[PDB]
């Protein structure tokens, strides 16, 4: 899975 990862990455990436 790369959904949760990409998600948890939005926390440190704040991608919109």
Torsion angles phi and psi, residue 4, rounded to 5: -60, -40
The answer to whether residues 9 and 15 touch, using CB atoms and an 8 Å cutoff, is yes
Q: Rounded to whole angstroms, how far apart are CA atoms 5 and 7?
A: 5
Two structure tokens written together for 11: 């926390």
Tokens of 9: 């990455």
Distance CA 6, CA 13 (A): 9
* Separation between Cα atoms, residue 16 and residue 1, nearest integer Å: 21
H helix and E strand count, the chain: 2, 0
Residue carrying structure tokens 């998600």? 7
Q: How was this structure determined?
A: NMR
């Amino acid at each position: 899975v790369n959904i949760t990862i990409k998600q948890h990455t939005v926390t440190t990436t704040t991608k919109g």
